[PDB]
Enzyme design. Structure first.
Site, PDB file in Angstrom:
ATOM      1  CG  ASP A 139      -2.068   1.021   1.051  1.00  0.00           C
ATOM      2  OD1 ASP A 139      -2.226   1.544  -0.071  1.00  0.00           O
ATOM      3  OD2 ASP A 139      -2.776   1.293   2.035  1.00  0.00           O
ATOM      4  CE  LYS A 142       1.937   6.592  -9.922  1.00  0.00           C
ATOM      5  NZ  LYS A 142       0.941   7.429 -10.677  1.00  0.00           N
ATOM      6  CG  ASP A 167      -5.662  -0.440  -1.290  1.00  0.00           C
ATOM      7  OD1 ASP A 167      -6.596  -0.715  -2.074  1.00  0.00           O
ATOM      8  OD2 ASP A 167      -5.723   0.495  -0.463  1.00  0.00           O
ATOM      9  CG  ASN A 168      -4.795   2.404  -3.627  1.00  0.00           C
ATOM     10  OD1 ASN A 168      -4.082   2.652  -2.658  1.00  0.00           O
ATOM     11  ND2 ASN A 168      -6.094   2.698  -3.658  1.00  0.00           N
ATOM     12  CD  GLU A 197     -18.604   9.056  -2.631  1.00  0.00           C
ATOM     13  OE1 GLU A 197     -19.602   8.672  -3.290  1.00  0.00           O
ATOM     14  OE2 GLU A 197     -18.068  10.173  -2.807  1.00  0.00           O
TER      15      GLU A 197
HETATM   16  C1  LIG Z   1       7.928   6.715  -2.918  1.00  0.00           C
HETATM   17  C2  LIG Z   1       8.194   5.614  -1.927  1.00  0.00           C
HETATM   18  C3  LIG Z   1       9.316   4.752  -2.148  1.00  0.00           C
HETATM   19  C4  LIG Z   1       9.601   3.751  -1.274  1.00  0.00           C
HETATM   20  C5  LIG Z   1       8.758   3.547  -0.133  1.00  0.00           C
HETATM   21  N1  LIG Z   1       8.828   2.621   0.866  1.00  0.00           N
HETATM   22  C6  LIG Z   1       7.769   2.893   1.718  1.00  0.00           C
HETATM   23  C7  LIG Z   1       7.508   2.099   2.944  1.00  0.00           C
HETATM   24  C8  LIG Z   1       7.032   3.991   1.254  1.00  0.00           C
HETATM   25  C9  LIG Z   1       5.844   4.589   1.793  1.00  0.00           C
HETATM   26  C10 LIG Z   1       4.737   5.104   1.039  1.00  0.00           C
HETATM   27  C11 LIG Z   1       3.814   5.556   1.967  1.00  0.00           C
HETATM   28  N2  LIG Z   1       4.359   5.290   3.201  1.00  0.00           N
HETATM   29  N3  LIG Z   1       5.600   4.696   3.128  1.00  0.00           N
HETATM   30  N4  LIG Z   1       7.663   4.407   0.064  1.00  0.00           N
HETATM   31  C12 LIG Z   1       7.377   5.436  -0.827  1.00  0.00           C
END
Ligand SMILES: Cc1ccc2nc(C)c(-c3ccn[nH]3)n2c1
Ligand SMILES: [K+]
Length: 214
Positions: A139, A142, A167-168, A197
């Protein structure tokens, strides 16, 4: 004041401590009240619940914590002895998620890992004593769904029956991830529709069960 802050404040003022259902409802109630598009929400929450109940994982990895709704959601259904590891790239979201879990009385079951998944996933085997994961909730970002899936395979963190729940996968969409798991003999896939929504759009979750290497 970030939205995560304001959500946590609301939960601490209205929900009952150590009552995970009341925390979830207060988050859902507040977000609705402010018309904030939720990261998960109760309907998707119901799908996550059924997956947890169906497979009874002892070790779950969650990618992306945000305000900690999904962490509370998942942790509340874990057996005693089970662990949820939760990865969160934003320190402030990590901090809120910890508080959320403390308030829900679930902190014993969860370890929050602060950092990017590409940095943290290779540390699982040795630094956090992981053999194989029973379930992975994707989650986060993407464009890391498919690479992290490949990374989890490469690190030997998946075994036959490991449940990936992403998800998504429709909005904003992870089509390459989908093309990979649906077409790979290493995965058995099921799709679950759910409505977002405000955007008023059918989104979905993909369940992909690892079958072992090819
Ligand atoms: C853009 C990007 C790259 C690597 C990465 N690892 C995690 C866990 C997350 C994240 C997304 C929302 N919360 N944590 N993340 C985001
Ligand atoms: K497949």
């Amino acid at each position: 004041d970030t939205k995560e802050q304001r959500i946590l404040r609301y939960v601490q003022q209205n929900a009952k401590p150590g009552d995970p259902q009341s925390v979830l409802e207060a988050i859902d109630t507040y977000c609705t009240q402010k018309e904030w598009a939720m990261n998960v929400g109760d309907a998707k929450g119901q799908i996550m619940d059924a997956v947890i109940r169906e497979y009874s994982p002892s070790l779950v990895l969650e990618l992306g914590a945000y305000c900690g709704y999904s962490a509370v959601r998942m942790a509340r259904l874990l057996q005693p002895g089970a662990r949820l590891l939760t990865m969160e790239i934003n320190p402030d979201c990590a901090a809120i998620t910890q508080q959320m879990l403390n308030f829900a009385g679930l902190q014993d079951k969860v370890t929050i890992l602060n950092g990017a998944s590409q940095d943290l996933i290779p540390q699982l085997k040795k630094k956090y004593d992981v053999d194989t994961l029973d379930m992975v909730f994707l989650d986060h970002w993407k464009d890391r769904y498919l690479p992290d899936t490949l990374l989890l395979e490469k690190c030997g963190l998946l075994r036959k029956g490991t449940v990936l729940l992403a998800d998504n996968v429709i909005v904003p969409g992870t089509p390459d991830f989908l093309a990979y798991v649906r077409g790979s003999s290493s995965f058995e896939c099921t799709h679950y529709s759910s409505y977002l929504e405000y955007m008023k759009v059918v989104d979905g979750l993909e369940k992909a069960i690892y079958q072992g290497p090819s």
